[PDB]
Amino acid sequence: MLQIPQNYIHTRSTPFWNKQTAPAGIFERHLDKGTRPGVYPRLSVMHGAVKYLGYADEHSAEPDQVILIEAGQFAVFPPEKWHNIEAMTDDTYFNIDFFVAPEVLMEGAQQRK
């Protein structure tokens, strides 16, 4: 399973969504982006099941990776990778958390005058 580095930071979260409430576009092929690159999405299924479908590129015809996520489980998605999800039942609902890399700026001994 793909893991999010322990030093990554949580930036945003989505409300709980189901087939009807989620933005329609999440069920079609797409890329999850942020302000910066390398954002890791973490989809958690609270009930039912959710399927992740990843592709080689923006136009490949069939998925090159499939992950089934059941209630009580989560899966982090490969960054900058085209994909779409699919709800397995009408009762399925889930939410998504996004994580980004931390910034480490070198500092000096004095303050900036």
| Cα distance between residue 82 and residue 36, in whole Å | 17
* 61 touches its own copies by CB under 8 A: no
Q: How far is the CB of 26 from Zn ion (least distance, A)?
A: 5
Q: Are 6 and 99 in contact (CB under 8 A)?
A: no
| Residue 101 binds its own copies (CB under 8 A) | no
Closest distance of CB 5 from Zn ion, Å:
19
How many angstroms separate the CA atoms of 69 and 52, rounded?
Answer: 8
Half-sphere exposure of 90 (CA within 13 A, CB side): 0
Q: Rule CB under 8 A: is residue 62 a binding residue for its own copies?
A: no
Point out which residues bind Zn ion (CB under 5 A).
32
Residue 74 found at the interface with its own copies (CB under 8 A): yes
Place of tokens 């005058």: 113
2, 69 contact by CB (below 8 A): no
12 binding its own copies? (CB under 8 A): yes
Contact set with its own copies (CB under 8 A)? 1, 3-16, 18-21, 23-26, 28-37, 39, 42, 44, 46-47, 58-59, 71-75, 82, 93, 95, 97-98, 100, 102-112
